[PDB]
Design a protein around this ligand. Structure first.
Ligand SMILES: Oc1ccc2cc(-c3ccc(OC(F)F)c(OCC4CC4)c3)oc2c1
Ligand SMILES: [Mg+2]
Ligand SMILES: [Zn+2]
Length: 322
């Protein structure tokens, strides 16, 4: 009842995702996904057996690393739930089909699975087997996808077993397109394209965004999930700070490995020369605010409160440097 009371916040920005993780027994991804599938009536729409959903969700959640500080199952649940809220924005009402909503939510859930807690560049610089498999190109993101789809083949895990062949083919392509777009080295090109759409966007008679081709539809979903991925500084401050604690631990541990190996330490990864507050300020100024401002423009004014929180959080971190 405690957990179930907290899951009543699932449509709200600033869900207490860390309390849900603890209240659910380190199962935040399973219970948040299950709740959202129920809320959106997805189990009935796609004839998904409830037992099949739980088995897949638990296996998926199992393949997130419980000893990685940031890129774990809690981050995955957070991104799912954030994507779920952004799908419900008034400017997008009745825009996406049930299959596109399914794809966006599923993509979010798998988008970092089996993440080892080090970056693509580190996997490239260390001659890793992952970088060798994927020829240095979206190494992690290709991997998260391969794992997320492969697990559907485990015993009683195919949650898509009752989709038509065409629905599965279309869903598979959309999920790939969405997850490869969370490759952080693609952020500038993705944002540049988003700006273009905002400059040239159209609305319908009802006031809703007009997306009449696959290219525009997938581009909005790509940016939606990328926004959810980069949504930590838009959250109430107590949530944001704990996300920063976790990312910096993960970054520090990567820099300790780059130290033990004689490599140049990556930006912000050296725990003997790291200004956490200044870096959060530059993170918001150069990455998170330019993206969220553009998204807010696309769906104006639906996202105004999310943007105000980001600007408050920016002011707060700034205020701690003088
Ligand atoms: O190659 C990649 C791929 C994915 C991610 C995700 C992030 C990321 C997420 C949250 C962050 O801060 C706070 F919001 F928790 C953050 O800031 C740390 C940086 C020094 C200023 C970075 O950084 C990444 C780098
Ligand atoms: Mg990622
Ligand atoms: Zn992520």
């Amino acid at each position: 009842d405690v957990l179930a009371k907290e899951l009543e916040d699932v449509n709200k920005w600033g869900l207490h995702v860390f309390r849900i993780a603890e209240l659910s027994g380190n199962r935040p991804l399973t219970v948040i996904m299950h709740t959202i599938f129920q809320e959106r009536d997805l189990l009935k729409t796609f004839k998904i057996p409830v037992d099949t959903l739980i088995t897949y969700l638990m296996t998926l959640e199992d393949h997130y690393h419980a000893d990685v500080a940031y890129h774990n199952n809690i981050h995955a649940a957070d991104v799912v739930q954030s994507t779920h809220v952004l799908l419900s924005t008034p400017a997008l009402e009745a825009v996406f089909t049930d299959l596109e909503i399914l794809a966006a939510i599923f993509a979010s859930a798998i988008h970092d699975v089996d993440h080892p807690g080090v970056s693509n560049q580190f996997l490239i610089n260390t001659n890793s087997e992952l970088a060798l498999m994927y020829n240095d190109s979206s190494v992690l993101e290709n991997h998260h996808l391969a794992v997320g789809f492969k697990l559907l083949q485990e015993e009683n895990c195919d949650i898509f077993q009752n989709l038509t062949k065409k629905q599965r083919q279309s869903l598979r392509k959309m999920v790939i397109d969405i997850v490869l777009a969370t490759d952080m080295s693609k952020h500038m090109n993705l944002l540049a394209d988003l700006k273009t759409m905002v400059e040239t966007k159209k609305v319908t008679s009802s006031g809703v965004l007009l997306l009449d081709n696959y290219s525009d539809r997938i581009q909005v979903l790509q940016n939606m999930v990328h926004c959810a991925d980069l949504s930590n500084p838009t959250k109430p401050l107590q949530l944001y700070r704990q996300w920063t604690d976790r990312i910096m631990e993960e970054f520090f541990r990567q820099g300790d490995r780059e130290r033990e190996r004689g490599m140049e330490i990556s930006p912000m990864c050296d725990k003997h020369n790291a200004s956490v507050e200044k870096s959060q300020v530059g993170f918001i100024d150069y990455i998170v605010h330019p993206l969220w401002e553009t998204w807010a423009d696309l769906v104006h004014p639906d996202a105004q409160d999310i943007l105000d929180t980001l600007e408050d959080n920016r002011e707060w971190y700034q205020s701690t440097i003088p």
